Copies of this chain bind each other. A is one copy, B any other.
Amino acid sequence: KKKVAILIEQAVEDTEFIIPCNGLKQAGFEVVVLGSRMNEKYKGKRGRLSTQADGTTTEAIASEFDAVVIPGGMAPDKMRRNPNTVRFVQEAMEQGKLVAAVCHGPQVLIEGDLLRGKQATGFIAISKDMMNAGADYLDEALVVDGNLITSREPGDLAIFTTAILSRLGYGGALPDEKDRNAEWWKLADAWGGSTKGDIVRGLNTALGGERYSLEALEKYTEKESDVEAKALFQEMITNKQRHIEYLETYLTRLGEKPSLSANIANQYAKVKTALTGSDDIYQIRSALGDIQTGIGDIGNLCAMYTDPIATAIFKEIYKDLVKYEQRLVSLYRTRTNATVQPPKPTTGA
């Protein structure tokens, strides 16, 4: 029976521990949770995971394990300060055991100087640290470099876990990691990640935010007499409509009728009729504030679901919002003949 260590510390990203744990248990492998100490209740950053350790990285013997899983969140910041944990992972790597790290997990690999020349991925926030540690950083769902398996975020957990399981001799009933059409979210769902309901709820949050911003932009464009600012707003309207199509397409695939539901609700009709005046510079401040709201909200959605497709949609929207923020702030600077006022968001998060 294969023995696998899952490392834990406080504030671990819950699903990054939960999914691999359930995937490994469902496959019939012995999972040993290795913490810094016994009798400490380790809590996930989102408060869903709560567990004590089975053992500690101080007494754990690397040779007994077939694989070591390093989850993310803020746990690696604490794990890397434990010299026993660093030692344990270095010994596992040295002995040819599978070392699998997701999200911030590679910080433990950085601490052990285990990334020199390695092709790997990890959460975008630590990408420069990985590169500085000598890694060929790739923006990929999965990177396997010999015995090192890495992934980026909760959206990749299904593929991450599948890659671990297959290399442990369990590929069943499971798609190939190179399968271009696998419904990865369903695997993550079976292993304790996002439900279909969870994913639809997230897509709906993004969609509602885009519908709102579309109505606001159409209101701003007709109030903007200036031909150039009007041009930027019209280009942003096209972008919103594009995002709305993607979200509706994916929602439709997941069994929803988003267009019908939206027609029935009519939640954003009062955005156009609400009076606000037509000051040219004020519309730009409003639009800039609205885009910053989106960057915050959509940014948060990028790390919340164990579906790589929903995750990819949110990242595309985020990328477009950041690009348009730079375009609005440029336009805003040029029009204002004074110290520019901060962005003025018209709705809450």
Contacts and interface: CB of A to CB of B under 8 A. Distances in A.
Contact of A296 (B36, B296, B325, B332): B36
Contacts of A179: none
A343 interface: yes
A292 B110 contact: no
Interface string A46-76: 0000000111101100000000000000100
Interface string A22-53: 00000000000000111110000000000001
A55 B83 CA distance: 41
A343 B132 contact: no
Interface stretch (A122-130, A160-168, A216-224): A122-130
Interface centre among A113, A134, A342, A348 (most CB of B within 10 A): A342
A81 interface: yes
Contacts of A132: 110, 129, 132-134
Contacts of A74: 74, 77
A256 B157 CA distance: 53
Given A329-B59, A343-B59, A296 B40 contact: yes
B38 A292 contact: yes
Contacts of A111: 128
A258 B326 CA distance: 60
A193 interface: no
A295 interface: yes
Given A322-B83, A348-B39, A58 B110 contact: no
A120 to B, nearest CB: 14
A169 B279 CA distance: 40
Contacts of A349: 39-40
B340 A37 contact: no
Interface in A81-109: 81, 83-84
A141 interface: no
A37 B343 contact: yes
Given A38-B292, A39-B348, A292-B37, A58 B343 contact: yes
A125 B342 contact: no
A14 to B, nearest CB: 16
A326 B82 CA distance: 11
Interface of A: 36-40, 53-56, 58-59, 74, 77-78, 80-81, 83-84, 110-111, 113, 124-125, 128-129, 132-134, 288-289, 292-293, 295-296, 299, 322, 325-326, 329, 332-333, 340, 342-345, 348-349
Given A38-B292, A58-B292, A59-B340, 17 more contacts: A36-B295, A37-B293, A38-B345, A39-B345, A39-B349, A40-B296, A55-B342, A56-B292, A59-B333, A59-B343, A74-B77, A78-B125, A84-B325, A113-B128, A128-B133, A129-B129, A129-B132
